[model samples]
Each structure stands twice: as C-alpha cells, then as structure tokens.
Target: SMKVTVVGCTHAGTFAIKQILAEHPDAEVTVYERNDVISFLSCGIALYLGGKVADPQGLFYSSPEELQKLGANVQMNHNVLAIDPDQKTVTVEDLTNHAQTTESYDKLVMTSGSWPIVPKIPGIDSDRVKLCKNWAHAQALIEDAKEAKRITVIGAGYIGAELAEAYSTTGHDVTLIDAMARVMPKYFDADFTDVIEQDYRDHGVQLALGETVESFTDSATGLTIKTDKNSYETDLAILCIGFRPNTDLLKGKVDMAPNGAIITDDYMRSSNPDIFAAGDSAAVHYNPTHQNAYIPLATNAVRQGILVGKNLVKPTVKYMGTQSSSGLALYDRTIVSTGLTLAAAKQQGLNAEQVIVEDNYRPEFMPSTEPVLMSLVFDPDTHRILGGALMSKYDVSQSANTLSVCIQNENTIDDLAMVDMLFQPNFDRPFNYLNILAQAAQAKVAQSV
Candidate 1:
C-alpha cells in the first residue's frame, strides 16, 4: 500500500501530491489523474477566447513531467471509478485499454473537481452547441467561431458574459441570454449587473434577460435557440448554466451535500478521518455567511489543496474560510466580487444593507482619470461587512482582494471607514476608494439607525 494516494489530478490533487511528497520525503505517493493534463486555470478561458492570451500553455499550473520530477508516481489517463473508504482502496479504469485496477493507500485525498451542467434541452447535442470546460473545447469553439456570424450564449454568468463580449468585439453578432431578470444574479445585484448590461447594449451585443432556452433547432444554415419569449437565430451556441461537483464515484462512500459536493470540516477532513476532500468537489466554509457552502473557485481549490496536504498526517493547517472571491473581464471593463451581494445577504436572513460609491481613481487634475464603481454590503444590525463588488475601467479590480480580506476578518463598517490603506495619486486618491466606500456605508448605517 502506498503512503499517500491522490485522486483526480487537477489543481487540488496536484497541490496535495506535491506538498505531501515535499513534507514527507520517505512517503510513497501515487497520483491518479483521469486527464492527461493537470493544474488548469479555468479562469484564463476568457482571455484565450478574446485572443489576448495566445499560448494555451499559459493556462496550466503544472505539468506531468514536473510532478514526475518531484518523485510522484503520476498516472495520467487513469480514471478512478470507485473509492472504498472502509477498505482504504480505490478502483481505477485505464482509459486507453479499458482495464480496471485497484490500489490501497494509508491516506487519501479527493479533488475530483466539477463538471459543466448541460441543460436537457432538445437538440442540445447538435454540432453547433458546445460547453466551455477544457482547452480542447475552447480551441474547437474558437476555430468554429472564426466563420460564424451570429452567436448565442446561454446563461449570463461570468463565462457567458466574458465570451459574449469577446465574440462581439471580434465582429460576431453575439447574443447573451439568462433566465434571471439580471446578469450575474448569484454574484452581483441588479445595480451592478445594470452597469454590465448597459455596456453590452452600448457595444451592440444583444441582451436577452429574464428568458430561458426552450430548445434548439439545427439546420444547414445555422442554429435557432427557441426561448420561452423569442427564437434567437445564431451560427453557434454556448452553454454556461453552471457546474455540479464530480462526486458520482463517491456517492455511497462519503457524506455529500444535496448537490453531490463532499462535506468537510474546517480542517478539510471528511467524515472518514483518513480521507480528505477539497477543490470544487468539496463544500467549503464561507467566511461572510459563517457557514459551509459550495464555492467552486480556483483560489479556494489551491489553498484547500495545500491545506489538505499539510494536514494529512497531523491536522495543523487551518483554513480561514472563503469569501467567494472572483473577477470577470468584459471588453475594456473589469468586474470583481467577494462575499455576498445585497440580494444574497437578504436571502440568507441577514439584516443586509449596501452602499454604492462612484468616484474617479485619479485626481481631477490628472490627465487621465477612470471612473470606479464600488459597492459595499454589510449587516445593518452589526454593521459588519458581508460582501463587496468593484467595477472599473482601470485595474481597480484588485481592490476587491482587499475587501475579501475585510470580509474574512469580519470587519465592521465602522472599522473599515477608518481602515488605513496606501494612497498614491497615480494609482489612488488621497483616501483609497475602499475606505471611501466603507465611510459611505457608515453614513447610511448611522442615518438608518
């Protein structure tokens, strides 16, 4: 039996294997990867589609040869079909020859990641329809989109919005549709989405909000997306509905949430102490909401993956939890969000309030000044920050990372108002926009109180 066995060699799996090998030099570690590649940055997909990032190699975090150099038994194209937690053995299938095998380990790590959720609409299997997940899918879409004039993208989440913008900028007739009344319903409020909506409209990209895809009709000329409200004609269609955890293999073996994400403690340990789970397949602690939630983010995945490795033999590393930090680039604008939106906080039964501040990054005297939009979400009762969103033409999206730290530390609106931050005329005003946002929220809180 090997000392350590890591299943699903994505970001989490690769992290665990590498760290475990480094920390425990005497230990024998084997990594079972279904895919030939590892450590892929799914977020870079938008840049790839936009032709901003030419080399696909820039999207990978690590390589098979790199893991081998670290003295790992990296088994690529080996799919793990089953896991026996009680017996401490994992069943695998060889993708090339269809041969099945089993291996046992003293310790186990599950980082199965997630799979794209394709809607069961009819004609979805048509050649013109596709899901953006792997590099191959992106390459195919980019190739096919070269000659395509009209493109319809379903789901107005970050991926759909980014791809729609990229396609539209490339002279394709891009149409973005979402069932919700607004875009990015899960991450941003209507006010924030409105900004993006206006940008899409101004750029000549069609926005079909508050609509669902009914079906698709495939023809020699093109594809027609039949929505409940209207039929959109397009040369190609992309589905970005969202993702579900890849936990089908561990159904009866592990305790999972309703959506098939493995339930783990703050230490990243599953119910089976010998087995740990992380990455998109695991339910992580949400710092803002103070609860275990499903947040499929690459940042969370990498941190949790490293933590899983450090806490393998002795649970030492403690996860500070996640604020669901993420960002999106649409044409010239960048939007970033952390923690809860105003709607999300209210839905969670918190006394939620929000403040929106619009300002310029530079002084009025500066030759160039870009508008910055910042929104702060807080608990009206405690005045503690619940979440934040930032939108700007400049690279002010990094400010959202600072807000993520505030949410993680459970800082109140009053604390943030006076929170010390760096200031430079070239990059920021006399007072950082983050502090300004917090101060604005404090004023609203005082008035309501």
Candidate 2:
C-alpha cells in the first residue's frame, strides 16, 4: 500500500484526500492539519459577519471526524513543523499533548493553503484590530462589531467591500480604504468599479482610495487610523489586505512563485516528483497569460485538489489552467469577470483592445427591462477573447461565466459575435448583450483596418 501524507485539510486538502481514498481505498493515508476544524469556506466569512447566515457551522463542508471515517488517519491540531522531501519524512507537533513525532510517506501532498497579509503598522496589535480569514476571525468580528459603531475596513477587495456594505446595512458607520484608486482593480476595471464604489458611497460608506495607511493610534473613544493623506477615528478596524500562500514548509525544496506559492507542473507535481501541491499554496497555469499565477480561489482549489489525486499514482490528468472567474453582489447590482482585464493585458505587453456595450437585457416592450453594461477584452491582432466583465441590476453575471469558458477554449471575437444562444423577450433581447459586445468588437476591428 502507498504511504500517503497530506498536509492542511482545507478545501484543497479535503478534496485531494477524498480523491486519493476513492482511487486507492486500502492505501495508508494520513492527514495533518494545524487547525481544529477543516473544510471551512473562508470566503463565506463576509455573509457570516453580516448576520446574513443564521449559523456559522453551515460554512464548513467537512470535518476531521468525517474524513477519518473514509479510511484515513485525520490528525487535527497536529502541526507539521518541517518536511524532508529527500528523506520522505515529516516532523509534526501534537498541539494538544505538546509532543513531536516523525512520519514517513511514499507520496507527499501539500494543500497548506494561504494566509491573510497583516502589515506591521504601528498600534496594529490593538485588541480591536482583527483579520478576516478564518472561522475564529469571523466569530471575533461578529462579536466585536456589536459595540463597534465606527468601523473601518482596510482593503477594498471582495471581503473588504462586502463587509463594508454588510455593516452599512446593519446600521454602522463604515469606511473602506484601498491603496488603489479603484476598488477590485484586480478583477474589474474602473467602469465596473465605478458603479459599486458609488453604491458604497450612497450607502454612507466612506471611500479612502489612493491612500496608504501610515499607522494606527490611540483615540479618545476608540482608535485613530492615520493614512498618508488623512486621519480618521474608528471604534474598530478590520484588515483584509489580501493573502499569501502558506507553503513555507517546502519553500526551498520546490519551485515556487515570488509570493512563495509552489509551482506545479501540468500533473500537479512539484520540482520533486515525489512531492505534490495544490490549492492556494500552489501557483496555477493561468490560461490568459499561459504562465503560472497565484490565484487563491475556492474554485481553483477544488479543481487542483482533484487533479492532484488523479495524477498522484501516475500522470493521467493535465490541468487545463484557470481564467480566475469570479462574481459578487452589491445591494441592487451584480458584477462578474474572468481572465485578464484590459489594463492587466497592456501591462503584460499584449496588444489588447476592449469593446463595451450597454443595452437592455430584454425587449423594452416587455413589462420592464434592466440595462446591463458588458465589456469584452480581446487581442486585436488575433481577435482572441482574453477576458470579459458584466454588470447590471439584473442578473447578467452568467455572461461572464460564458466568456470564461470561451477564454479557456481560446475562442475569438468572431466566435463570440456569431455564437448561437437562446433569445426570449422575457429573458433577453433578440441579440444578447454578449453577442452585441462581440459584434461591436468586430465592427471596431474592421473600422480600425
């Protein structure tokens, strides 16, 4: 039987172990996780913190007891101190008993995942200052916010944005800060962000964009946030700066990205064939750039975990790569995007062009119709669809999902222009916004020529 040892039983770890058990049921599999819990959806912390979720337990999909029943030794609270790829052994510490032990493995799978980036700003050690990454963090934020009247969220990414809006709805004075001039610059362009940012402002959430945090200081009532540009007082502070892969155990042993995300081959094998990595701890083949990019997403984690299991015994599956598709809801609007934004493409030196279209989702003659703003980014030279985004009061987010598949398949603007899709007066216009987007791109390409 193959001696398999898996580390960090989160999204990637849980799925990989399940796949391994399904393939080799009798194999000796051991799981080491530092956390007492497993398979918690960290992304759902926003909803939980907002009180939108009645119970936090629903956020977790699996537990150690559940995995142990699947014929594997699930060791919760067992921290992996170090990994010896050459000797095929791992040194671990039992957090409960304060004892150390060494275990051997024929195959080593690492799904250590990632951690939230906590900057070393002065006064950051305040008890009220908190992170938004794990279950404990969620509980602490909820409990702390009950009396936190003036709340400031540092970082205007998804978590920060959502939490800002959530707290606003719950009748709190919220302020959202970001170093960038726009919110969600990584996923959405200014056009998409403009609507959401305005929504934040309309909800009484202060916007502190294009500003850097200098430090935090003591205030009369609570805390004072000092930015390079200005200062504000807040009762509580939440940091959602971003995340870095938690892969230090095998840092020098395997090829890794600058951010320390392990670089895996098509078969999910690291520089050492005996060692494998998946989830946030690993850099994935980004379809748009055809290069390794560290995109820590639950969708990516699950797919990579399964791929690792499929190729663990032998190379059988090839990771097709990812477009980093994602979506979010803000009050009355839905925003979604995938692949590379036009600015990102230009930064990468790709001759990219984008066509934006604004139109009604259905026939205006209907009872009512919602207008959607859609944009498609493509290489003008090849007409290859590189990325796309959609925003609307109605649910037009599915178009972004469609574009994700097109980018993954290397579909071009022409393919999107004439793509066959259903049309109903009640659902969509004679030509959907996506079809119109590509058709406009085709016309632009022709006019430029």
Candidate 3:
C-alpha cells in the first residue's frame, strides 16, 4: 500500500489529505502540523479581534478529531525539521516531549503556507509590538488592545486597513500608516484608493502614507513609534508588512524561487515526480500575465489543493491560472478587483489605455439608484480587456466580477461592448455599467488611434 505524508496542515494541506484518503481508502496517510490547529481561517483574525465573530472556533476549517475519523493520522505540535527527497523521509520533532523521529513516505505533499514579513527595525523586540497573522496573535491583541488608548497599524494593505477600521469602530484611537503613497497600492489605483483613505479619515482614523518606520520605543505606560517623518505615541503597534513563503524545510530538496517559494506546474506538482506543493508557498502560472507569480489567496489554495490530489495518480486536472481577484469590505462599503490596474499595465510597458465611466446603476427616476464609478483598461493595438475597477454605494461593484471573466476570456474592447447581460429595471439599467465601461474604453481607443 502506498503511504502518503502531508506536512503543515493549512488550507492546502487539509484539502489534499482529505481528497487523498477518499480516493485511496486502504492507503495510509499521516498529517504532521507544527501548529495545534489545522486550517484555521487566518483571514478572520480581524473579525475575531473586533468581536464581530463571536467564536474563534468558527474559523477552524478542520480538527484533528474530524480528520482522524476520516481514517487519517493527524499529529498536532509535530514540527517537520528536515525533508530528504532522495530518501523520501522526513525528520520531525515532537514539541511536547522534545523527541525526534523519522518517517518514510512514498509520496509527500508540502502545504507549509507563508509567514508574515516583519521588518527589522530598531526596538522591534518591544513587548508592545505584535503581528496579526494567526489566532493566538489576535487573541492577545484583543485582550491587550482593550486598555490601549492609541493603536498604530503599520502597512495599509488588506490586514492593516481592516484592522484599522475594526479598531476605530471599537472606540480605539487608530493610526494607519503605509510606506506606499496609497493604501492597497498594488491592487487599486490612486483614485479608488483615495476613496478608501477618505473613508478611514471620516471615521476618525489618522492616515500616514509614504512614510517609513525608523524605530520603536517602549515606555512604562505605552510605546512610541518613530517614523522617518515624525514620531507618534501609541499604546500598541501591529505589523502587517505582508508575507513570505515558508519553504525552509524543503530547502535544497526541490526547485524553488529566490524567495523560497516552490515552483509548481499547473497541476501543482513540484519538479520531483513524487512531490507536490500548493497554497501560498507555491508559485503558479498567472494566465493574464502569462508568468509564474505568487498570488496567495484562499480561493487559489483550495482550488490548487484539490488539483494536487487529482494529479497524484495522474495529471488529470489543470489549473486555469490566476487573475488575482480579491475583495474587501469596510464599514458599509465593499470593493473587489481583478487583473492589472491602469498604472500597473502602463508600468509593464503595454500600450495600455483606460476609461472612467460614471453612471447610475438604475434609471435616474428610480427610488434608490446609486452612482457607480467604473474604470476599464485595455491595449490600444488589440483592444483586449486588460482589467477593471468599480466603486459604488450599491452592490454594482459586482460588475467588476463580470469584467474579470472578460479579461480571463481575452475579450477585446469590442467584445465587452457587445456582450450580452441580463438586465432588470430594479437591479440594473438597460445598458449595464459593464457594457458602458467597455463602450467608454472603445471610445478612448478610437480617439487615441
């Protein structure tokens, strides 16, 4: 019987193991996880901290008891110290007993996930400094932040923006700072980002963009964060500097990127025939960009995890690559985007052009029609849809999702303009905002050409 071993039971790890057991009932499967919990939804850390999510257990995707019932050995607190692909064995350490053991396997699946990139600044070791990555960190911050008079969140990415808003809602004086000129710099352009920045300021949250942290100072009462521009006193500081792949255990064993991300094919198999990797630690092909890039998200992880299992026996399933689709909710507003932004397309040296359209989702005479702002990006030569962005009070932002599909299908500006969409007077206008944006893009293309 073939024996399969899985290391690091996160989203990808748990899914792969489950599918493996279902396919090969008699096969032996062992899951070794460094953390006690498996597949904890790290995205809910902010919701848990804000008390919106009452139970932390709700974030768990799987439990040891659950996996054990599925005819798999689930070992918690067992850390894989080293992996030897040549020998097909892994050396693991038991944290409870401080004992080490080696286990050999016929196949190995790596879903080690990623680690938050904490910048090495002076006084970073201060007790008041924290990283909001896992559940433990969220619990500690929730307890400590209750007494905090002023809270500072560094890095205005998704985590920083969400936590800043959560803290502000909970009556904590919050300061959100980002090294970039705008929040979500990579995902959204300056105009859309300005809307979110204004929302933060409207809620009594301080904004500090394009600033770098110089040092941190711990005091008897609280802490002080010294930035290159100025120093601010705060009760606590949370680092949300982003993530780096966790591939240390597989070092020198598999083909990896310079940053330690395992390189995998569309089927999520590593260079080694018997080895596979997925999730945040693995770099997969980006269909839009036609390159291998790390677009780490739960949606990608779960999809790739299932594909890894299907590819175990034979390369059956194929990934459609990634478009980096992501969405964020702030207070009462929600926004989602996919593919490249206008600035990013231009930066890539594409003859990129963009058009911004402002219209009401419904007829002007409708009772509750909200204004929608949409931007479309396309190439001048081929007029292919490259990307899009949407902002609105209504749920019309979902129109961006349609554009995502268009970009994936390699639809040109003319394709979007003539694309068919179901329209109702109550929900959308006769000419949907999506088509309107495409028409706007075609107009710009004609003018420029």
Candidate 4:
C-alpha cells in the first residue's frame, strides 16, 4: 500500500485524496490541513457577500468527516511545519491538542494553495480592513460593513469589482481603487473596461485607478486610504489586490518558480518522483502561451488534483493545460476572456492581430436585443486563432469557452469561419459573432495576399 501524505485540504487536496481512494483503496492516505474547515469555495465569497449564497455551509463542497468516510485519514487543523523530502518525512503540529508529530510517507503531495497578496501599505492592519478571500473573510466583511457607510475596495480585479458592486447594491457608498488605469485591464481591453468604470461611477460607486496607494489611515469614525494623487475616506476597507502561491514551507525542498509556484510535470509530479503537487501550488502548462504559467484557478486546480491521484501510483492521465478562461459580471454587463488577448499576444511578441465586431446576438426583429461586442485575436502569419473576448448584457460568456477549445485544438481563422454552428431567431443571429469575426479575419487575410 502506498502511504500518501496530502497537504492542504482545499480544492486540489480534497479532489486528489478522493481519487486516490477510488484508485488505490488500500493506500494509506493522510491529509494535513491547517484550516479548521476544508474545501471552502473561495470563489463564492463574492456571492456570500451579496447574500446570494444564503448559507455559508453550502460554499464548502467537502469536509474532513466526508473525506474520512471515503477511506482516508483526514487531519484537519494539522499544520504542516516542514517537509523533509530526502527522508520522505513531514513535521506537523496539531492545532487542537498542541501536539507535534513527524510522519513518513511513500508519496507526498503538496496542495498548500495560495494566499491573498497584501501590499505593504501602512495602517493596513486596521480592524476595519478586511480580505476578500476565505469564509472567515466573508463573514468579517459582512459584519464589519453593517455600520460602514463608506467602503473602499482595493484592486479593480474580479473580486474587487464584484464586491464593489455588491456593496453598492446593498446601499453602501463604495469606492474601488486600482493601480492600473482600467478595471480588469488584463482580462478586458479599454472598450469593456471603460464601460465597467462608467457603470460603477454612475451607480454611486467611486473609482480610483492608475494611482499609487501611499497608505491607509484609520480615523476616529472611519479610515482614509491615501494614494499618490488623492485620499479617499471609507468606513470599511477591503483588500483584493491579488494572490501568491502558498508554497513557503516547500520552498527549497522542491523546484519552484520565482513567485513560489511549484514546477510540476504533465502528470503533476514535482522534481522529486516521490513527491507531487496540485492546485494553486503547482504550475501547469498554460495552453494559451504554451508555457508553464502559475495561473491559480479552480478550473485548472480541480483537474490537476484528479490527475495527481491518478498519477500517484502510476502516470495514467496527463494535464492538457489551461486557457485561463474566465468570466466576469460587472453590474449589468457580462465579460468573458479566454486564451490570449491581443495585448497579451503582443507582449509575448506573437505578432497578433484582432478584429472587433459589435452587433445584436439575436435578430433585429426581437422585442429586446442587446448589443454584443466580440473580438477575436489571431496570428496573421499563420492565421491561427489565439484568443477571444465577448461582452454583452446577456450571458454570452460561454462563447469564450468555445473559443478556448478552438485555441486549444489549434484551429485557424479559416477553420473557425468554416465551422458549423447552430443559430436561431430567439437565440443567435444566422451568422454567429464567432463565425462573423472569423469571416472578417479570413477577408483580411485574403486581402493581404
């Protein structure tokens, strides 16, 4: 029987252990998680804040008791202190009993996950300030915001943007600040970003973008966040700056990226054959750029976790990599991005070109037809589809996923233009926006030749 020690009982760890039990039932599987609870859907924190998720318990998919019933030892509140890879030993501390123990394992899997990136701004340690990650953070923010008239959210990413809108909807005066000139600059270009910015400003939410945050000062009544250009007052402060992989304990023991994401093979195996990693801790092949990128998403983590279990005893399945496909809902608009944007492609020196199209998703005769803005990025030299984006009032986000598949399958603009798609008067136009952009690209390519 293989003695498997899985660390961190989050998305990757929980998924890995369950699959391991399914494959190797007799295997000695012991999980070490520092959290009091396991498998909290960190992504749902935004919904939790907005009261969309009425019950907090529903946010968690699995528990230690649930995993233990699946024929594995689930050790909750057991913090992994150090990992000795050479001896295949890990030192752990029990939060409940204050007891320390060292355990041995034939195969060790690290799923330490990632932590929110808190910048070094003074007065950030105030009681009014809260992080937008984890269940506790959600509870704390809701509790703290009850009396908060003015709220400021740092970082204009998904979390920041979502929470800002959520609080605004709940009748709180909210301000969203970011170092970037635009909101979700990495995902949406200026076209959609400007819409989100204006939407926030119009909806009683203030925006502070493209400025350096100097410090946060706590006042008698509230807190004032000071940036290089100006200072804004808020009763509550929420930080959604970003995240970094939580792989500090396994730092020098395994090969890792500069940002501390563990470097893993296609099988989720680390440099050491006996050790494996999954979830946000490990770097997987990014299909978009065809490189090892530390994109910590549950979409990639869950698949990687399942693979770690399959490859634990032997390499059976390999990770296909990720396009980092993501969707965002800003107030009334829906934004989706998959694979590489034109800017991302240009930054990589990929000679990328793009065609943008704005039209109704459905027929013009419809009673209500919202405008859909879609863009496709492709390499002009090879005419290969690299990435795409879709934005509209309706849910056109799933098209980005289709585009992601196209990018993964190495589909060309001509291939996309010629691909078959269903269309309906109530659903979509005769020529889908995807095919329309592809046809436009084909025309451009033909004109070049």
Candidate 5:
C-alpha cells in the first residue's frame, strides 16, 4: 500500500484517483482541491452561456463526495502552497479555517491544471471585464450576459469563437478580436478559417483580426477596448486569450517547459520519479513533432491521468502522445482537424504539401446529401501523412479520429489512398470522402514523380 497525494481535483485528478484505487484498493489516497467543487467541464461554459443548457449543474460530473466514496480522502477548500520533492511533503493551507499543515506522501500527482491568460491591461479589473473559465466565472458571465447588450470578446480562438457565435445567435451585438489574421489559425488553414470568419460576419458578429489589445479604459459607455489597430466601444468584455499551466508549486522542483508545463516521460513520470504530472499542468508529447507541447484538452487530461495511475509504482503503460485532434460546431458547420496543419508543418521546417478535396459525401442520386470540404497535409518526399481537416454541415467529426490514428501510426498517403472503407450509397459514394482525400494526395505525389 502507498500513500498518494493529488493536487487539483479536476479532470485529471478525478480520474487519476479512480484508477489508483482500482490498481491498489487499500492505498491511502488524499486529494486536495482549492475549490469546493470538482470535475467542472469548462468547455461546456459556452453551452450554458448560449442558453442551451437549462441548468449549469449539468456541466459538472464528479463531485468531492463522489471521490470520497471512491476511497479518496477528499479535502475540499485546501490549497497546496508548496511542495518539496526531496522531502516528499506538501505545505497546504485550509482556505476555510486558515490553518497550515504539512502532509507527507509516498507518491505525488500534480494535476494542478491551467488558468486563463489574463494580461496586464489598464481598467481590465473593472466589473465590465470578465473571464469565462470556471464554474464561478461561468455564473458571472451568465449573469453579465443578461444585462450586457454589447459584448466584445478578446481572442478569436475556440472559446472566443464559440462565445461570439453564442452571443450573436442570442441577439446580442458581439465583436471578436484577435492578434492573428484569422480565427483558429493554430487549428486550420486560411481556406478553412476563411469560411468560419465569413460565418461569423453573416451572423452579425464583428471581426477585429490582426490587432493587438493595448489596454482597457473606462468610458461613458461601459468600457473601451484600445487595440494597436483600432478601438471598440463595448458594454462588457470577455477575455479568452488562452491558457497557461498552473505549475507554480512545482516550478523549480520539477523540470518544466519554458511555459511552465511540467515535462513528463512516456509513462507520465516527471523529472522526479516519485512525482507524476498530468493534464493541463503537463506538456504532453506531440506525436507529429516528437517533442513536448502544451496541448491542454480534456481528451489529453483523462488519458494522461490513467497513464499516471498505472505507472505510479512502475512504468507499466506508455503514453502514445497526441495528434491534438479536436472538433467544434458553429452555426450550421461542423469543423474538425488533427495533427499539424500545413502552415505548422512548414513552420517546423518540414517539406509539406496539402490536397483539398470537395465532394458530396454520398452519391448524388441520394435524396439528400451534404458537401464535404476536406484537406490532407503530408510530407511529399516521404509520402507520410502529417495532418488533415474536414468541414461539413453533417457531423463528420469522427473522420478526424480516423486521421488522428493514421498520424499516430505514421500511415503513408498511398496507404490511406486505398484503405478499405464502407461504400454504401446511403453513407458514402463508391469512394468514401476520406479515401478520396487520400487519393487526391496520391495524385499529387504521382505528379511530383
């Protein structure tokens, strides 16, 4: 039996506790969470703010009481102030009682997660400026939305894009600003984001692309967002710039990336063997680059947590890394992508090429069919698939999962060109859209030959 201590009871922490108990039922597991609540799905904040979810309580899954039932000594409202790797001890403060205590552990799991990037800007602390990340933040946003008419969302990434669409759909004047030239530049290419940006405009949401936010200043109207390019007047502002790892406690004690994401091995063990880091606080191995990258998604968190649990005693299961696969919905479009985009591959100094295939998902004879626009990026010389993206009205998001596995296995363009797949007329043509995507890339390879 071992004494284990886990910090931050969110996605990674919750699942890690469950798996630890499953592996060693009699192990003394202790969980310390700064917040009273646990397992809050911050990604679902848009759903709640968009009025899709009737009650916000549905956003949370596991609770502190539930973890306790799973044999974890759940300590709510306890903040771990410091950790000493050599001593295997944690200095924790009870947020409620204001008492300090030192806890010893045989093993330590760091699932401290991440926090939204809030830049230092004047007047940013005003009541009109808000953030959307946690349970309380969601509650505040929901309340603010009811009273605020004009909302300016800073950052045009996933969260900001979702919020802009949500507020626009709900009859609010919305403006989305970003330092990049297009929305979700990290995920998709110009062609894909071009469509998404137009959709935002068609839905009455203003776009302030290629601009840097200088500061937030008070005005007669609620506030004014002064950017390097322009200024916008808004009733309320929501900053969704991005996120940074919450790994301050283990800062100098553990090896971390420049961004503070704890670096871990394939078995999720940190620089210190006795300590393991998972979720947003950890820099996961990027499959495409074969390097550590900070990709903090729920998908990565849960998987890393399970690996941490299994490898706590000894390196049993190995983490296969991630393709950074993800999907999102906006208006009538379902967009998905995986691995490195062509731009990203080029930035990495790889000789990459891409093929775009737009076709009907099913046979034209079908009563109804949707147009699927897809692109596949690959190394032309090596013929290896690197990354891909798909956009359609239908939920073809699962195609991204298949592409993710292909990238993980390092499948070649020719390998996928003739990969066996269902050819039913109801679902797809004689050649499925994915097969066509690969075949298109195969044609490009032949042209070079």
Candidate 6:
C-alpha cells in the first residue's frame, strides 16, 4: 500500500483524509495535528459566544476516531516539526509526552492552515488578552466575558466585527477599534458600510474608527488601550487584525506567497511535484483577477481540500477559479459579495464601472416586502461582469452565488440583463433583482457609449 501523510486535521485536512479514504481504500493515510482537538468549526465561535450555539463540543463535527474507523491511521496531538523532501520523511513530535518520531511517506499533503494575527504591542501578552480562534479560546472567552464589564476588539474584519456584536448584545461595553474609517471596508463600499456602521452604533457598539492603536497598558483590574486619537479602558481585549498562513515547514521547499501561502497549480500541486498543499496554507485561483490570490474562507478551504485529494496521485479533477464569494450579517441586515468590488476593481488596475439597484424583493402590493440593495461591477469596455454585492434584511445572499457562477463562466452584462429566472410573488418579483442589477449596468454602459 502506498503511504500518504496528511498534516493538520482542520477543515482542509479532515476533508483531504476523508476523500483519500473513500478513493484509496488500501492507501496508508496518516494525519498529524498539533492541536488536542481536530475539525473544530472555528468560524462558529462567535455564534457560540452569542449563546446561539449552546454546546461548544458540538462545534467539532469529526474526530480522530471517526477517521480511524475509515481505515486511516489518525495521529492526534502530534506536531510535525520538519519536512525533508529528499527522503520524503517528516519529523513529528507528540505534544503530550514531547516524544519525537520521523515517518516516511510516498505522497505528502500540507494542510497546516493559518493562525490569528497577534500584534506586537505593550501588554498584549497579558493573561487578560484572548483570541477567538479555537474551541479552547472560545471556552476561555465565555468565562472571561461573563466577568468583563468592558471589552475592546482590535481589527474590524468579520471576526472582530462579529465579536463586537456578540459582546455588545451580551450587555458588555464593547468598543470596536480599527485603523480604517469603516468596518469590512475591503468587502463593502461606503454606502453599505454607512448602514453597517450606523447599525453597530445603534446597538450600543463604540466605533473607534480612523485611529490606529499605538500600544496597550495593563492595569490592576483591566487594561488601558492607547490609540493615535485617544485612550480607552477595557476589561478584556481581542486582537483580530487578521491571520497569517502557517506554512513554515514548506518555506524554501515550496514556491509560496510572501504571506507564506503555498502557491499551487489548478490541481493544487506545489513547486515540488510530489508535495501538494491546500486550505489556509495555499492560494488557489481567483476568477475575477485570474490569478492565485490569498483569500482564506472555509468554503474555499474545503473545496481546495477535495480538489487536492483527487489530484494527489493524478489529476482527477480540475479546480475552477473562485470568486471569493462570502456573506456577513449584523443588526438584522445581511450582505454578500463575490469577486471584486468597485474599489477593489480599481485597486487591481481594472477600468471598471458599477451601478446600484434598489427595490423590493417581493411584489410591492404584497403585505410585506423588504428592501434589497444590489451593486454590480463590470469592465467599462468589454462589459464583462467582474463582481457584485447584494444587501437585504432578508437572506438574499444566495444572489451572490448566482453572480459568482456568472463571473466564473465569463458572462457579460448583456447576457445577465436578459437571463430567464423563476419568479414568485412570495419569493421574488417578475423583474428579478439579479436581472435588474444587470439591466441598470447595461443602461449605464449603453448611455456612455
């Protein structure tokens, strides 16, 4: 039997093992994970903290035992210390006993994943400071937040934004600090962020926007947070600046991004032919920019994991590029984005144009119809759809998925404007929002021409 070694057992690694076991029944698959727990749904930590997810244990969907039953050797609490490509051997250490062992493999997959960005600031290493990455981190936050009177969250990314909402809704004085003037600026435009920022303010969230944190000072009871503009007091602080890919083992051995993400082909194979990498450790295809960009989402991780597994021995499947489609919600409003935004398009040196469409999701004559906002971005000359955004009180995030396919298929604005789609008075209008958004884009482009 061919020996295959899979490192890390999170979303990407777990799926990789499962795919391998299903296809290669006799393949000796061994998985190494440094953490005590495996397959923890880290993205759900905020929901758990908000009391929406009662049991933290339920956050984990798979276990080492479950994978072992599939005829794979599952190594729990094992850390891979180093990788030797010449011998196809990996040095591993048992996290419990500090014992070390070197294992040989015919094929190797690196799914080491990523870690939360911890900034270098004074008093940041204090015991009161917490992270919201793993189950253990969530458990500790659950206890600390209960006793905390004031909370400070650095970074306005989804993790930071969601945690601020959770903490504020839980009755804590929550201050969301960000160097940018608005939260989720990369994913949204000023129009959308205006509403999102105001929503947070209405829900008792303090927005320390447009100010960069200088340092953090510790106090007997809590901590004092210092920013370029002002200083604030808080009982707890969370650093959610972002994340850095954990691919230290693959450095110099594999072609990787400056951020440490392994650069892979469409089949997920790295610089070394025998070595493949996926998940947060690898950068996959970006459909809009038509390049390998670092966009780490659980949706992308699992998708990459499956593609890499099939292509390990041979190219069984080809990975289509990603639109980096994602959704976010807070204060009863939902928003989704796929591909580049108007600002992102410009940042990428694309001459792009965008149009906004606002209307009711259902029939206006109906008893109720929530307002929906749609933004479409396209190339000015080619008129090819590049990106889109949808926001609504209702769950119209599904629209983003459809737009993602259009972008991936290289559909143009003219095609989308007249596309046929189902309609129901209770669900949607005759002029579907998708068609309407494209219609507005077509009109703008036509008028300019």
CA lDDT of every candidate: 0.86, 0.90, 0.85, 0.86, 0.91, 0.87
lDDT of 5 by residue, 1-449 (tens): 69999999889998899999999888999999998899999978888777789877888888998889989999999999999989899999999989999999999999999999988888888888888888888888988888899999999989999999889999899999999989999999988999999998898999999998888888886798899989999999999998999999988988999999999989999999999998999998998889889978999889999998899899899999999999799997999999989988998898899998899899889899999999999999898999999999978999999999999999998888898999999999998899999999989989888
How many pairs of residues collide in each model?
0, 0, 0, 0, 0, 0
Tens-place lDDT digits, model 3, residues 293-380: 8768888778878888888777898888877878777877767777888889888887787888878878877777888777787787
Give per-residue CA lDDT, model 2, range 296-368, as digits (tens).
8899889989998899989999999999999888886888999989989988899999988888888989999
Candidate 4 Cα lDDT to native = 0.86
Worst 10 residues of 2 by lDDT: 42-51
Residue pairs in collision within model 1: none
lDDT of 1 by residue, 47-118 (tens): 776778878888897999999899888889999988888888989889989999988889888888898898
Better structure of 3 and 4 per lDDT: 4
TM-score of model 6 (CA atoms): 0.98
Which residue pairs collide in model 6, if any?
none
Order of the predicted models by TM-score, top scorer first? 5, 2, 6, 4, 3, 1
Cα deviation in Å at residue 122, candidate 1?
1.5
lDDT of 2: 0.90
Clashes of 2: 0
Ranking by lDDT: 5, 2, 6, 4, 1, 3
Model 1 TM-score, 2 decimals? 0.96
Worst 10 residues of 1 by lDDT: 42-51
Better of 4 and 5 by TM-score: 5
TM-score of each: 0.96, 0.98, 0.97, 0.97, 0.99, 0.98
